[PDB]
């Protein structure tokens, strides 16, 4: 990726990605709009199992696109299973996509509604040994998506908000141990699920998407901090890190299933 130049600006944004990553116009791209009236309840979907009690966060990184909270996935600690998944998926990192204003920022939409932001907890299928091998498989990753709306503060998110000052620019990282991701979950685990892809290049079609129906609420102050981050590196002209979301892509030959009636 040392020669990647994609981003979210007018000249290298989502509409340009297909040039270096043809799969951008593929058959199972993400995100997508979730038409609530067309999604069908699937009584055969197992309950979702989110086991994060043993999760071990290690570091937070500004990668020039978003910020990644990374976990130690060298062992089966934090795992996602059940739901539409077969097997065990290990949590490797989480990040967000957000907007310049509260009216936009999420990648998936619900009946065309855009949320202020969207949290993605990324997990890889342990049957493939490592993340690199997993992304080359149609069932290699499981990403849990959670919508954020602006209202009351999310206590569990403040530790993340407070460390952002230390990783303002691209390439900066900071120790970030003992962060509990259970603090970012809504009360209900009802979800929609469909086969899709990574939403940033390489846009690989290796993801089983699980998007929770219940959004979490974060405060204006919390999201304002996200918007103070920079896409640029230290010493460069400031480009605020905002609107780092890819818009909804064609659903094509796919069905979105609901875990609830
Ligand atoms: C670890 C990793 C490798 C890769 O090639 O692409 C990624 C894309 C995302 C963004 S998202 N929105 O698709 O989760 C997150 C993590 C990765
Ligand atoms: Zn993402």
Author numbering: 0 to 125, 127 to 261
From the manuscript:
The main structural features are represented by a central twisted β-sheet enclosed by helical regions and additional β-strands. Here we report the crystallographic structures of hCA II in complex with two aliphatic sulfonamides incorporating coumarin rings, which showed a good inhibition and selectivity for this isoform.
The crystal structures of hCA II in complex with compounds 1 and 2 were determined to resolutions of 1.67 Å and 1.56 Å, respectively. As generally observed for other hCAIs containing the sulfonamide moiety, in both adducts the inhibitor binds to the enzyme active site coordinating the catalytic zinc ion through the ionized sulfonamide NH- group and forming further hydrogen bond interactions with Thr199 residue. In particular, the two coumarin rings present a different orientation and the ZBG in compound 2 is shifted a little bit more deeply inside the catalytic cavity. Previously reported inhibition studies showed that compound 1 was an hCA II inhibitor three times more potent than compound 2, suggesting that its binding conformation was energetically favoured with respect to that adopted by the fluorine derivative.
